[PDB]
Amino acid sequence: HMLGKIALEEAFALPRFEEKTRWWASLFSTDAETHVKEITDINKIRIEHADKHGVGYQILSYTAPGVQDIWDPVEAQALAVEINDYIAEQVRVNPDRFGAFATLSMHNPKEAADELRRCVEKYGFKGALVNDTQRAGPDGDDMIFYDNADWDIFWQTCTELDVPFYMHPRNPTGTIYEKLWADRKWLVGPPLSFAHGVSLHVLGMVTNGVFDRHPKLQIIMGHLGEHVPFDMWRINHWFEDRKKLLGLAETCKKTIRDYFAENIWITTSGHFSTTTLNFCMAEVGSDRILFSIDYPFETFSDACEWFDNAELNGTDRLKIGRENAKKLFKLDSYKDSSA
Template sequence: MKGKIILEEAFNLPRLAAEEAKLYASVQGAAALGQALADIEGRIAAMDEAGVEMQVLSLTSPGCQGCADPEEAHKLAVESNNYIAEKVRANPSRFAAFAAVSMHDAKQAAEELTRAVIQLGCVGVMLNDFQSSGPNGDAMLFYDHASYDVFWAAVEKLDVPVYVHPRMPSKTIFEQLYRDRRCLVASAWGFANQLSIHILGIATSGVFDRFPKVQLVFGHMGEHIPFDLWRLDHKLDRDRFPQMRMAKNKTIRDYFATNMHITTSGHFSTRSLQSAIAEISSSRIMFSIDYPYEDGLMEGSSWFDTAPLSQPDLLSIGRENALRLFKLDRAPHNMKPGLTLQELEIGGLKGPIYPDEATHLRTATRG
């Protein structure tokens, strides 16, 4: 399928890329990862080969959320947003961007997000799970606390989605859970384990009830949540948890119909995708890859392009849902909704049906 849009695709500032890549890769792999994170223009050839029309770029995890110093975190957000806005302006038909914000102060986060959206053209915001805080960086700030309502109010007013992404755990969590289980600390299990609690905290704290237009996106086929919906809703018993701030007549499944979306980033399983479609519908799922943490664009693209899905589901997940949610049909991106199966080369269709389709259409129109 041509024309795909991918949403969880990381970059890093050139001054940080090489060193920070060492947190996520072996000594041998860190150099290549750092180079891939810093190289934005060089992605276009691989995008063309994989049938990807647009990447929505985001500052790599943990980004601003890893800065325990509030001033440092905010400076990084401003620098990152200014940098990526220039890259997008240079090629708006292939790239868009999520804003980065420091979440030490909700009002400051709201103000920087507003600047990034209104002045710089960002199409949403990426939050890398909790905000590190405190003198030793071990405190964790979560956005389901009522003090963040000013941030959620700005998100709703701006009408842009919030993508929440995992990060490495705090020092205390690492010591308690992962010191003797290091293989589970990151993408194998820990990322989804930690982030799913934050996502569910946002839902059960009533954020979607107070700000019903807020749209939350999360990757890796939903961080385990779609596959546990029945049990979640069965066990969130209002008699057991009378202080839960979530609306009394709502379930987590309800919020998937109104406020939550998932992507396929880094999770290329056909059975999992089919299960997610059955649980939350194809209208709440978007294709993504998780580049460059997944090695290249072809593995994920080849999997998706050949997945046994209906043509409407391929269209929705591969392109139309993201185009609509992130308003990519507007300036400066001007992507076209509703392209034909021939234009997107879906179902084995490629090029015009007739040798000169334009001539045929003109003739047919004249009657």
């Protein structure tokens, strides 16, 4: 019933990466042929789906693992630039229906800062979406986290442009994959490993003071917060009543609840559960929750039939469905934006 919804965990892939798309689809799709067409399509099938399910605006982003899988910094940077140029041309076809997040190589803070700036200033991109850590090292076995002082120049750019950063998952790779996941591989992705990566990274940003140095910074997590709201009580207790008396306070000046009120957002991507949504409204607050889908790994029908029909007060259905995002991303009018 609700129209003008905004979705913002919505992936695309370059047409020239069909092999990579099919490999990823072999893990996460039950219809590879349909998946290939849907993840590459922008302006036809995606619009048909959105027209049928009351989605007015979609903020598109590059599929995982995307650029974060690329450990050669020169190749990674060139791919990020290529993807951003590509999607900017695609969204120009229907700008009243689509915006985009920047795709970044995260090998170098200044390089990523400059490319984010290019995307926002040249193309009007709405923020950045990065698939967790950047693979690095001679054969990609290292990983680059962004929760340290080397990345201050990048987070300062996010706050200067006043745009959010969506911390999306990626698959485990290298030694981590071999040690923890190969022998229980069906847990890779949405069932468990994705959330383990994102929650580690975002709570690393918390405990390493990123939101203290950059109190304006907005970080978004999918999948109703990648487990974190479930342990809001336990994290807060073990911070305020334990670790904050042992040294954590030196690099973490506020409570986990403060950071969720001031800095962190969660979306409903891939987690179409009213019971869990209700629990998140208590632990995080409806003001900090955004509707999203996770297309094409999830269907518009599943996400939108769920949300349109969920038992929910009308105030929060409007906020989660579009008004929260309209404010956060400073959106102009779009289809059914005031319907």
